[PDB]
Amino acid sequence: MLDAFSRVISNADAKAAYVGGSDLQALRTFISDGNKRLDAVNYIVSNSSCIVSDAISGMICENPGLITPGGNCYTNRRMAACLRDGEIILRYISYALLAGDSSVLEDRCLNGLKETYIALGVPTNSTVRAVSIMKAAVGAFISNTASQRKGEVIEGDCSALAAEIASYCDRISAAVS
């Protein structure tokens, strides 16, 4: 798996060129803004439970047909597998946020996920909703604009981090879609 730094090394290797200014600058910014990132990651792993239960729960309240005899969330065993999948998904997203790369979310999570859902009969369209609420919940907990959760981190700009985590959420839906 790669991160922000080995991602540049991969791209610079393709040209057999040492890493210099152009590519070093941005990785220097990773460091500078690096403390914002660790908080960003912490805002996720600190409310990882609420985001998953809220997202699986929301996707069902809007589609009650899921907890119906014939729905993919019907029975305790299907509910528990879906909550677990949401937790796993939110976990790999959190990994890519700590690394500043999507390599780990796609290599170990989104690699064969949809096709997997095809076989089991797991609704990809509903899953894409669950992920959408998690993106909203996540996005809010990073900006510290959480409707209910209000922490005390020193104020600043985390829009690059929000835009980056949203992109990761977007490659999740894009993969099972």
């Binding site: 798996m1 991160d3 080995s6 090394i9 890493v19 070093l24 220097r28 792993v45 959190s94 690394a99």
Partner: protein, 164 residues
């Protein structure tokens, strides 16, 4: 690529756990040490062609016999390949300095080397002579900062231990 993040994230993935404190704290080591190794990285990129000639030079100065027929440097062509690899190693060193781990060197330089150099009859001591010179040519204040030199020598020491 093995780094602070990749190691910490892989340890957590194996245990199915979200990133935690020692994970975020491990990367705080990143934010502290990047400067040093990042300095040495730009120093290589900015002047690696003088570093490879110097390294390539010392090598053939120590092992002149390699310029013999049926040897590893019997012709300028194979000679060119020697300095070329030295530059590969130095370029992966810069990679390892930017990554902050030994991954680029590990997979791109060290894995298979022994089999390749034994199968292809390239003396290991020549490589070590090139990287021992490079390490000791380093001048503390002159070439880079003190802690940048640490990361320079650490990387070069890593390549050497792998070939011995």
């Amino acid at each position: 690529m093995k780094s602070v993040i990749t190691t910490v994230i892989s340890a957590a993935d194996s245990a199915g756990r979200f990133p935690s404190s020692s994970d975020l704290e491990s990367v705080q080591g990143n934010i502290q040490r990047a400067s040093a190794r990042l300095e040495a990285a730009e120093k290589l990129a900015s002047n690696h062609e003088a570093v490879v000639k110097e390294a390539g030079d010392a090598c053939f100065g120590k092992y002149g016999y390699l310029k013999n027929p049926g040897e590893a440097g019997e012709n300028q062509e194979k000679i060119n390949k020697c300095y070329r690899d030295i530059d590969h190693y130095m370029r992966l060193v810069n990679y390892s300095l930017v990554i902050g781990g030994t991954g680029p060197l590990d997979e791109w330089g060290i894995a298979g080397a022994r089999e390749v150099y034994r199968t292809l009859n390239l003396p290991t001591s020549a490589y070590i002579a090139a990287f021992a010179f490079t390490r000791d040519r380093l001048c503390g204040p002159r070439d880079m900062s003190a802690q940048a030199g640490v990361e320079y020598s650490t990387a070069l020491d890593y390549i050497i231990n792998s070939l011995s």
